[PDB]
């Protein structure tokens, strides 16, 4: 699954969102105006879990 956050809301409540992705383990997309500047934020836990799977493949 995926949530979308206004970049101003993401900036104003950054610490709360870094707490949320590390508690719920879901990614969120931060939207601005230029869609080529869209970013995905995820927890360091889930990131390491994916890189672990991608190197297990090798």
């Amino acid at each position: 699954h995926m949530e979308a956050v206004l970049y101003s809301t993401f900036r104003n409540h950054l610490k709360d969102y870094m707490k949320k992705v590390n508690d719920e383990f879901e990614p969120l997309t931060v939207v601005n105006k230029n869609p080529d500047e869209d970013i995905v934020v995820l927890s360091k836990s889930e990131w390491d879990s994916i890189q672990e799977t991608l190197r297990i493949a090798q």
Partner: protein, 84 residues
């Protein structure tokens, strides 16, 4: 609010006791939050459907889930590790 464990859940709980103190602390934080309110709180509680109706799920980490259910005045844990 009694705390039930099946054999398989207690086995899971003791595996995290020996390995990874950080995961043990996370599981414990979830158990405290469940004891406050089994239906809401941290770890994104989600009820399960179909043949698992009655069971609930919270997120220990990205790969593991805490499966539990409430039968009256008690919480019953079904699982603390997703795969061995």
């Amino acid at each position: 609010m009694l705390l039930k464990f099946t054999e398989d859940a207690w086995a899971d709980y003791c595996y995290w006791q020996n390995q990874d103190k950080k995961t043990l602390k996370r599981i414990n934080k979830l158990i405290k939050d469940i004891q406050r309110d089994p239906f809401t709180g941290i770890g994104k509680p989600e009820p399960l459907k179909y043949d698992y109706q009655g069971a609930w799920s919270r997120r220990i980490d990205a790969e593991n889930r805490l499966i539990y259910m409430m039968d009256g005045d008690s919480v019953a844990f079904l699982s603390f590790k997703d795969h061995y």
